[PDB]
Design a protein around this nucleic acid. Sequence first.
RNA 1: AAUUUCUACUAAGUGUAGAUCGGUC
RNA 2: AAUUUCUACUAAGUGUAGAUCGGUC
Lengths: 117, 117, 49
Amino acid sequence: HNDEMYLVVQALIRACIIKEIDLYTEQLYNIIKSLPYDKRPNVVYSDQPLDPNNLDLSEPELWAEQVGECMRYAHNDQPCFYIGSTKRELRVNYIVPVIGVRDEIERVMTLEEVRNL
Amino acid sequence: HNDEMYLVVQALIRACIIKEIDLYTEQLYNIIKSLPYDKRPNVVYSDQPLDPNNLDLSEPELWAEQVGECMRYAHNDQPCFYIGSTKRELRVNYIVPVIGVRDEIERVMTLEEVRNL
Amino acid sequence: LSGGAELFMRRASLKKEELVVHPANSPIANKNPDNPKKTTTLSYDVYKD
RNA sequence: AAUUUCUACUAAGUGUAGAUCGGUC
RNA sequence: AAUUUCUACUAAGUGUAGAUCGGUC
Ligand SMILES: [Mg+2]
Ligand SMILES: [Mg+2]
């Protein structure tokens, strides 16, 4: 019960991380659903733990299309973030908003969502 | 490094717990602020990590006064919950919703907040 | 009227795992910028398909 | 829950409806 | 984003605005 509890501790670190991401997803969901679909930021999407205070701008998976339609998951009720229009079916559950359009974006844009409105 | 990191890991477990309490405080904050002050649940109030899945009704600090005036606490952006009227000034930020008057009440009533109305 | 009335039975495609809803008593945003309102709120469930 | 101070508010969007003369246990 | 099916909505509260003859590549 030495290394097993060690990887359990790693799973608990990932639990605190994914609950920080889920908490910021909830408050960020509130400030995004406060916006009338025009002052929305261009948001990086992912289906992986994306940890906005530890964002890595390395891979070409970074994308900057305007988010919308952040509705539930009605077996577990979630904020869900279609990255395009209604009819693109690109639902995700991990988002980080950034500055503007594509190509070597700026870095983080943390907690400036009230300055978008 | 033998005994200190042990309580560091325990502090991380308490961090995951208090972020669960903060998340349920956030969702519960939204579902309570979507209610018109008359169908409000009778809310146990505390300024302590209150963890409704690990609730113990042994102390005499149980109280079921109807909640009201839930608003924002922007110095650390915390959701603040008054427990009396406007003019009782007993602000708290840890809440558990149950049913009814005082004395050996119903126990927890978690995840039934949509059934309030 | 005319002949050849045809009753078509149709099966289910979306299973019960991937249903996504608009919940009750939650002010959601609105798509059209020409909307004179900005939010809307219902008292029941609005599903997806 | 914003006020010349107090109270009931959010009340058409940094406010609305009232009332208040004296310094003194 | 709820439909007899399709599309843009929430549009006064399990809907609203239009359009659709045909089984066949
Ligand atoms: Mg007052
Ligand atoms: Mg549609």
